[PDB]
Design an enzyme around this catalytic site. Sequence first.
Site, mmCIF file in Angstrom:
data_model
loop_
_atom_site.group_PDB
_atom_site.id
_atom_site.type_symbol
_atom_site.label_atom_id
_atom_site.label_comp_id
_atom_site.label_asym_id
_atom_site.label_seq_id
_atom_site.Cartn_x
_atom_site.Cartn_y
_atom_site.Cartn_z
ATOM 1 N N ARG A 33 0.856 -1.162 0.000
ATOM 2 C CA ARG A 33 0.000 0.000 0.000
ATOM 3 C C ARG A 33 0.893 1.212 0.000
ATOM 4 N NH1 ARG A 33 -3.841 -3.684 3.215
ATOM 5 N NH2 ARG A 33 -1.769 -4.303 3.969
ATOM 6 N N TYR A 138 -8.295 -11.541 -7.464
ATOM 7 C CA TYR A 138 -7.337 -11.618 -8.562
ATOM 8 C C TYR A 138 -7.363 -12.937 -9.288
ATOM 9 C CZ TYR A 138 -5.638 -7.721 -5.835
ATOM 10 O OH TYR A 138 -5.534 -6.583 -5.090
#
Lengths: 162, 161
Positions: A33, A138
């Site tokens: 992040r 994903y």
Amino acid sequence: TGYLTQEEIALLLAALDGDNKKIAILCLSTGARWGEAARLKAENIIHNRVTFVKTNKPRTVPISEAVAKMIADGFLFPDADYPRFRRTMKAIKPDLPMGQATHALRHSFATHFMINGGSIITLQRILGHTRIEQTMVYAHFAPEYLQDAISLNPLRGGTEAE
Amino acid sequence: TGYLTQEEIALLLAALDGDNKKIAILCLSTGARWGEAARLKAENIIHNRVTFVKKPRTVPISEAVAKMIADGFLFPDADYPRFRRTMKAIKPDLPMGQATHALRHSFATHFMINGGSIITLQRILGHTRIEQTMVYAHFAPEYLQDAISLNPLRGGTEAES
Ligand SMILES: [Zn+2]
């Protein structure tokens, strides 16, 4: 849950500079992040292995010599500028949802990791997801190989063993 | 410990014969439960693909395996109790009534140890939910250095053109 194409990446890196650029490179290399990458200290990089601390549980992700060389040589990124990063990102990828700029690079790492044949389980660990279901966002990027039932079974697709 | 090692497999196959042996080979190749493998018919094998019927699912096998198991019901001289006896001899510590699933667990376990995808395994086993399949997750290598080579920068510091 949008991500950057290869060519968006290229433009992004060309347009950033200083610590923002290095941070981008780090996030694209590790699935970090923005925040955890930006707050990173020299001591969190040992033998080309980056450790993102407890806040979310701790986790460690390896990086190439080249990346480690470039980002390390206290806090690694004291001239980070998130708003400028955000601006530049939004300019390359206008259709990017609000406040998702912190995660766009993480999602790009993950997405290409899967496209390129990575294991969803390894990815779970790298991302530091607590549950695989988080990482399954994903999954549809992965190729599937049913014939692996043959070659990966314990007889190696034969009749015998070993 | 729930599954057979490579060497246990070797002993098991050496010790079985006839239809039992073929069924074992089939279960080790496909993750079949004993029952669904033993009740298998010629018609359930099309182009080296085995179909386990009603939830249904289909699993591919090598030519060699198909050749060996499909020269009606494929295994009319199966003998489960003899299978069980032989299994228990090779793997004494095997939990009660788990002999029907030991080979399914061994397929799954090695599939993961050998780098297989947990998702593909889910489909093969015919699990409804991935969480069911995550019992095998800890067997997967976690090749963390794939973070480097599978990067969108290919482990470098920059983009391509
Ligand atoms: Zn079972």
